[PDB]
Symmetry: C3
Subunit: 436 residues, 3 copies
Amino acid sequence: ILHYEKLSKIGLVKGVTRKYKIKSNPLTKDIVIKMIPNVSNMSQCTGSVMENYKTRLNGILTPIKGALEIYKNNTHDCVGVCMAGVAIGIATAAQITAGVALYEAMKNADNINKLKSSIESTNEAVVKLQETAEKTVYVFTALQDYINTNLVPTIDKIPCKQTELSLDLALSKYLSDLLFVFGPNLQDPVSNSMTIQAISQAFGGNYETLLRTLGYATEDFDDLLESDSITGQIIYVDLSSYYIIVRVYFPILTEIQQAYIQELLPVSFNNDNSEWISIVPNFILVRNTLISNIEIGFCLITKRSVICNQDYATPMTNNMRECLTGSTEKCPRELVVSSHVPRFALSNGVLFANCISVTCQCQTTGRAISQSGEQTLLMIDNTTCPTAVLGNVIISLGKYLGSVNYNSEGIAIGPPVFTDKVDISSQISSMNQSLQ
Amino acid sequence: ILHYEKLSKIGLVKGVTRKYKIKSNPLTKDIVIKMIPNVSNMSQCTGSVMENYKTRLNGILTPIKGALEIYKNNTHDCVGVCMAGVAIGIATAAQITAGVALYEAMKNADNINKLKSSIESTNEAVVKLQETAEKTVYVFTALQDYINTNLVPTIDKIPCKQTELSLDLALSKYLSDLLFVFGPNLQDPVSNSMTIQAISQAFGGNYETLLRTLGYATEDFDDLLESDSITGQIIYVDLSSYYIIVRVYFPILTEIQQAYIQELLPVSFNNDNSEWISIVPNFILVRNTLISNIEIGFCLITKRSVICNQDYATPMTNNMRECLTGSTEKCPRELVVSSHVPRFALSNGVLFANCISVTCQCQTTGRAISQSGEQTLLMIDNTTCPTAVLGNVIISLGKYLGSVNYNSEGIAIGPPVFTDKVDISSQISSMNQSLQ
Amino acid sequence: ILHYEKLSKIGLVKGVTRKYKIKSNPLTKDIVIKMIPNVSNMSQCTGSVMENYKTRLNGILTPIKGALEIYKNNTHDCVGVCMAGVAIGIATAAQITAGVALYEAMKNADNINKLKSSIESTNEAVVKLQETAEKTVYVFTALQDYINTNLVPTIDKIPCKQTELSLDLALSKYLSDLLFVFGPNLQDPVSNSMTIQAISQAFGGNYETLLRTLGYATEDFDDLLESDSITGQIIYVDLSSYYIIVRVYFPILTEIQQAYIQELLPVSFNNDNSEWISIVPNFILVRNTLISNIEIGFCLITKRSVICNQDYATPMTNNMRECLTGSTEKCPRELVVSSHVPRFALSNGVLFANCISVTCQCQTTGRAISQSGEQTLLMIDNTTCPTAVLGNVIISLGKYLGSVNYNSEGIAIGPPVFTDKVDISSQISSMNQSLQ
Ligand SMILES: *[C@@H]1O[C@H](CO)[C@@H](O)[C@H](O)[C@H]1NC(C)=O
Ligand SMILES: *[C@@H]1O[C@H](CO)[C@@H](O)[C@H](O)[C@H]1NC(C)=O
Ligand SMILES: *[C@@H]1O[C@H](CO)[C@@H](O)[C@H](O)[C@H]1NC(C)=O
Ligand SMILES: *[C@@H]1O[C@H](CO)[C@@H](O)[C@H](O)[C@H]1NC(C)=O
Ligand SMILES: *[C@@H]1O[C@H](CO)[C@@H](O)[C@H](O)[C@H]1NC(C)=O
Ligand SMILES: *[C@@H]1O[C@H](CO)[C@@H](O)[C@H](O)[C@H]1NC(C)=O
Ligand SMILES: *[C@@H]1O[C@H](CO)[C@@H](O)[C@H](O)[C@H]1NC(C)=O
Ligand SMILES: *[C@@H]1O[C@H](CO)[C@@H](O)[C@H](O)[C@H]1NC(C)=O
Ligand SMILES: *[C@@H]1O[C@H](CO)[C@@H](O)[C@H](O)[C@H]1NC(C)=O
Ligand SMILES: *[C@@H]1O[C@H](CO)[C@@H](O)[C@H](O)[C@H]1NC(C)=O
Ligand SMILES: *[C@@H]1O[C@H](CO)[C@@H](O)[C@H](O)[C@H]1NC(C)=O
Ligand SMILES: *[C@@H]1O[C@H](CO)[C@@H](O)[C@H](O)[C@H]1NC(C)=O
């Protein structure tokens, strides 16, 4: 376990405790995104912009169909999914799993494609199609709202050459937004790591409409959405009607048993007439009594749980392990030169303040609280005095659950470090000479 | 303090000198952002979209008020702001300061909330309300412009079922834009480090309107705005009318006395029949004769000053200070293999170039400029000849201010390094292996 | 030169082979971007917003003209381009080259400026003007389409105070979008490294319209566009009509002879009853039998080529070069702690899998595939059994081309490493302590 009391003297005050959960057991739903709007009522003087747009869009969608066909031509049934690796050549585990999912989805994709005329005939942003007697499929058109709201009502009040230019500009804007996702960046359409937010770029970035139409099945919807857990996969691309079929995955957030995330608050501390800040990860992941780093940039942090779409646990150095489990001397530290580093923190009702680097007096005492040159931090609870003053904040404090004689006991202190990108090169290069 | 001559002989040509500026003394103004538009004039067939949007927005905003209420409950002027830390539990210095500011703003927030009916009744993008007999408050409604410009005029030209769909799509787009900032990502709404641009996402990202309506208080407006110095804080959330109160901070740019930013220009140089580029920071902070690094990626680099919303000074390795103070050998270098690395530079009118890599000839005599094999760079000035050429550029040069015999004196050059992400891991691994 | 067979035993399975191509031989086109829209037809109720917008835009643009005038006043024909470095002061190689290009473009800029009245009289998003008897120039207005589609048609259906507010909001949104690029961030406007997508932010981000109107005539267009290969440069700023002149560069992709990019697929492998992953870059660049790294994150990855707007070759550690050329023991490895690390891969129809972590039972044999406690990965080809099963995927396999005794030969393995930044700091600091 983590030794919070020893970490506090370093400057690492214990923070909130959060539970760890990852995506599992995804459900599947199929949607059709029509990437070309219907212009039946505006065709009177739509000009020649549509042929150019179709050619440009075919130039984008052709690589997608080409990258799908390699798995399409190698997936079939033999006397489950039964693939042929000779004509596949290069494939990772994720690619092969995505191909299996693609073949599985083809069973419904065939019946979806059976309604090609209905898909093309759609002229609203969201349309319901009776895909079978007991199931339905929704159709999303990229720019149908804009055409039905702005361009169509203004088809005669302005010279419709200007309307042609406006439609061309709208389509060009849509394509420029698309090219970030569906352009040559999408080298691997056979994969399910593409988030619904990115897929909605084919719909103008309005993923909320897609999710609301499909259904808010769970109460953990927002955590799944922000954490990039709701993903989709393209399973069919049509170069005649210019539409794609996307299978959207709706997973459930499953708590990881015997696992939690502990956050450590860094506080500057005094040592040798100078201020220092400890260098340890802000978030530590504990799972089944095993301490390991978690890369938290991709994960989502809430008030009670950490939500990740993938198991983002990363290895932790053994020295870091002993720094977090009591051995303070192995805990690295950095000198502080900036004057905007926190100098006190409150945890469990008791504040850990660097009472020498900031004015520090209590309230009922009406006197100052003195921090000697040997103590890194000062523990202030209501044992010494029940209300403290720090700058312009007057705060009352609760009892401490740790050692009664905390402020009278010191510890060893670790060696200094520097964490700049180029400082790493200098340190490695310099000591290499020392090694020789 | 920086030895520019030796740095140039390394390949680090002295660049522009800029002053250091940080924000301080922030003035405060209060604005109200209503996140639900008024649909009174278009409620004839808006449908059930409004109730669903209200439910979604209530779900979005409930955690915000839940987090604010933790502090709002435990701060009550007692026998200055006087907070109870027992029920706060977990808090940092910045969070406690933000809570103090929140309570201070509550005194005016009470009078602002006294105008709940007026805030609800707003039907314009920007509305002026008399806070007091002398003070006024501006109300910003997110989608009011869109509704009043598009949905109201086109309320009967199109079937209003389509209008309901259009309004639903617009609100969904608004919510998708919001969820980046106001969604579960906003775990800590108490803190006041959220930029005005991010807050404007609740107003469609149009922070320029927010700032212009309040007032361009100073000529340093753009530097403050880009550097993220203009920040806001949510001080009250109402779920009955779905609006928030934001206290916008307008700091002033105060230059730090006896401090400046020095920029070094890297130039590839010849050494041992090959090309190298020195590995040192592009920007160097000198403050009160103390040299320190600066994570300038978060700051703004203008022509005459560096603007930072916080003091971003970070420590610099001692060896690196020795390198910048004259110790040539302690500066690391990287072998260059790219052919698109700069090979000459101009400072104070004197030309530093690597004539081995790029051909140099001098126009006033029409003969080549020769760089010998043991010289890193060639200093070319009008002392040598008034005009030299470099490929297709003909340039005239001033006089050097350093040593007259610059080109005849050599230095000691540093040790090679590699700066790739995996190179660090490989170097550490081998360097451990040698020690064992 | 790369020993794929030995890399497979580590877990680095050979992937796709791509060709390396860079920007070269850029063509030049001239366009005019007018950042103030023509509002002649809305002048009845335009209000006073236009004067304030003009003042804001003048404040935005004055630094740009000030920075251009440094090279404008210091460049003239001398008895090619002939610059004066005395009054330039500070300049890099890129800045000087950009200034030379700026002067070269001034010849056409004068003829463009001769049509100032025509430029300022434009009232459409894209307008064609004849700068000479033979050549023509296009004009792009930032917000003309929005005005002519929304504000003009709605000039009487709603009170024009609302129209004035709407125009002010639109201009403020346009300025908010602009300030990310054309604001104080644009410290060097002379340089030509700014992408066309960024330049289009002055046109609403519709770079597709610019490129389509300019008449592209290449099959490598999408690769050039994604890779940020198409760039522009501002060559003149007018503070009276508020327009800028941009010289757009259209290059050609030239394949680098004797150069290709090799991709390596990481696969978790068993060692000492534990699962590990190798720390080696995903992409390796080979040029004339010289191996080098590449920050391919800046580049674009396609199915058969890597496209970069600059030569992004970076040096590689010598030990690392030995690692990629058969010396297996120098390759670092990291202990897999997550349960979402790939565990099998397919290359050339040959399946590399870690049968310890994932059960393998190939259907043709009808029995499970057993991997011992000495073999890092198990090679499956149709010699041992044609079709293999891994979980839910049934795959048929080709024949190996390397050693037929692959599964019986073992290799040496490397030392463990950790890649976290804090882990790097802990590692570096710790062995300084042991070194002494
Ligand atoms: C378009 O034309 C059809 C007739 O084919 C008509 O039913 C419909 O109302 C028109 N408008 C829209 C928005 O579809
Ligand atoms: C897949 O098969 C189709 C015909 O069924 C063919 O047109 C296409 O080129 C094939 N794709 C390959 C072999 O990659
Ligand atoms: C300190 O505060 C706790 C509540 O947090 C209280 O129970 C205890 O009596 C207090 N001790 C004093 C006032 O001495
Ligand atoms: C390495 O150890 C020496 C011991 O004297 C110390 O002075 C130096 O600062 C240390 N450097 C690093 C980068 O750990
Ligand atoms: C470390 O020093 C040795 C001997 O001086 C040298 O051979 C080796 O290349 C150095 N390693 C570096 C600088 O990474
Ligand atoms: C704050 O106080 C109110 C009213 O007493 C209560 O409803 C709410 O739950 C409290 N919130 C806390 C204690 O976090
Ligand atoms: C709604 O209509 C009334 C009718 O007089 C008008 O006064 C009011 O300004 C309208 N509201 C909006 C927001 O347009
Ligand atoms: C050389 O350049 C200097 C500027 O540094 C100038 O003052 C001088 O007149 C030039 N010509 C000489 C020194 O002959
Ligand atoms: C350049 O010259 C013009 C007059 O020709 C002057 O107005 C401007 O200020 C000069 N700029 C600089 C940087 O000297
Ligand atoms: C303004 O109105 C005139 C009236 O004839 C028209 O010719 C011109 O095109 C209009 N300007 C526009 C639409 O930008
Ligand atoms: C393995 O597959 C290849 C074609 O990929 C075939 O030529 C060979 O005969 C097969 N070997 C066996 C034993 O079936
Ligand atoms: C250094 O090598 C030793 C060899 O026994 C190993 O135990 C230790 O973990 C290594 N540490 C680092 C930071 O590489």
